[PDB]
């Protein structure tokens, strides 16, 4: 109800791994759920709730369909549900749309997070990665798509893989912190629900800066992020969060908010807020989520 109930579901090996990284990094205010979808292997998790329903998406779908009642029990009462298969493919890409449709049929605000692999990784048959996206799209309120190729314009191979993991985690945290963790400017969850319900595909931009003019700088970087693929101009829904320390000033906060308004489409809904994270020092971190056209 008033403290929103947010459930983050990692499904398949990539999804469970994503959730374990969220746990290791101290992501707060959410319940973690790890769903293993493979018969032959189990990735363990320190998630609160675990379900072992076990490289084919079709296998993952059936496994989740078969466990639909149990998954529904786990999700019941959630105001918001994140679903991700994380990096890599496999059975998780088949199971994710099932978890999403259960969440949504229950009335929860349902947010998918999906990555497009780097082009250098090649491609498995049937266009199955794109098929995974479309299935998840049909099944979510908002699907946040992270095109990993765009990271190479923001690099060694190890750096590329690490960037991919970082932005994936932020695909959840940027939004959840805005809701769960107080800052000077707080948001109404109903407006989040208002802007994200039925919104469809979304893209994300991030930006970071320190010291002098940091909030404007980080915001300008986020808004121009290659991960947004220049979707900012035409976006009809924009969520923006600025994370920083307690000393984050209202004037500098408002400058960033003004910038995003000036860059967004005239008719865009804009949800804006701040997050206090005193671990950041004199750094601020902006997350922008753009949806619609």
Ligand X SMILES: Nc1nc2c(ncn2[C@@H]2O[C@H](COP(=O)(O)OP(=O)(O)OP(O)(O)=S)[C@@H](O)[C@H]2O)c(=O)[nH]1
Binding residues for GTP: 13-17, 90-92, 121, 125, 165
Q: How many residues in the chain?
A: 293
40 binds a copy of itself, rule: CB under 8 A: yes
Nearest-angstrom CA–CA distance, 72 and 91: 19
**Closer by beta carbon to a copy of itself, 3 or else 250:** 3
Minimal distance, residue 249 CB to a copy of itself, in Å? 32
63 binds, among a copy of itself, ligand X, none (CB under 5 to 8 A by kind): a copy of itself
Q: How many residues in the shown chain lie near ligand X by CB under 6 A?
A: 22
56 binds a copy of itself, rule: CB under 8 A: no
Instruction: Give the strands of the sheet with 6-11, arranged side by side.
Output: 49-52, 31-36, 6-11, 80-84, 109-116, 142-147, 200-210, 283-291, 237-244, 269-276
Residue 60: which H helix or E strand, with range?
helix 57-66
Q: Gaps (C–N > 2.5 Å) in the chain: which residues precede them?
A: 54, 154
Q: Which of 25, 28, 58, 73 binds a copy of itself (CB under 8 A)?
A: 73
Q: Encoding tokens for residue 142?
A: 């908002």
**Closer by beta carbon to ligand X, 37 or else 110:** 37
Query: Is 81 in contact with 10 (CB distance < 8 Å)?
Result: no
87 binds a copy of itself, rule: CB under 8 A: yes
Contact residues for a copy of itself, defined by CB under 8 A: 5, 13-14, 17, 20, 24, 38-44, 48-55, 63, 66-67, 69-70, 72-74, 76-79, 86-90, 106-108, 157-158, 161-162, 165
């Amino acid at each position: 109800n008033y403290l929103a109930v947010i459930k983050v579901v990692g499904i398949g090996g990539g999804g469970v791994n994503a959730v374990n990284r969220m746990i290791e990094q101290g992501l707060k205010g959410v319940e973690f759920i790890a769903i293993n979808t493979d018969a032959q292997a189990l990735l363990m998790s320190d998630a609160d709730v675990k379900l072992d329903v076990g490289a084919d998406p079709e296998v993952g779908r059936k496994a989740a369909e078969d466990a639909k009642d149990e998954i529904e029990e786990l999700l019941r009462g959630a105001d918001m549900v994140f679903v991700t298969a994380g990096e890599g493919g496999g059975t998780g890409t088949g199971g994710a749309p099932v978890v999403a449709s259960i969440a949504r049929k229950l009335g929860a605000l349902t947010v998918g997070v999906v990555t497009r692999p780097f082009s250098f990784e090649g491609k498995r048959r049937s266009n199955q990665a794109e098929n995974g996206i479309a299935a998840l799209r049909e099944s979510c309120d908002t699907l946040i798509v992270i095109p990993n190729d765009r990271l190479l314009q923001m690099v060694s191979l190890m750096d590329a893989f690490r960037s991919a993991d970082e932005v994936l985690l932020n695909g959840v945290q940027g939004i959840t912190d805005l809701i769960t963790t107080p800052g000077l400017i707080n948001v109404d969850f109903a407006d989040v629900k208002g802007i994200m319900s039925g919104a469809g595909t979304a893209l994300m931009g991030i930006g970071s800066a320190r010291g002098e003019g940091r909030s404007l700088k980080a915001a300008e970087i986020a808004i121009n992020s290659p991960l947004l693929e220049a979707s900012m101009e035409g976006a009809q829904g924009v969520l923006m969060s600025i994370a920083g320390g307690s000393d984050l000033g209202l004037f500098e906060i408002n400058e960033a908010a003004s910038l995003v308004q000036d860059a967004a489409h005239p008719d865009a809904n804009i949800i804006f807020g701040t997050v206090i994270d005193d671990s950041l020092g004199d750094e601020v971190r902006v997350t922008v989520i753009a949806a619609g056209f």
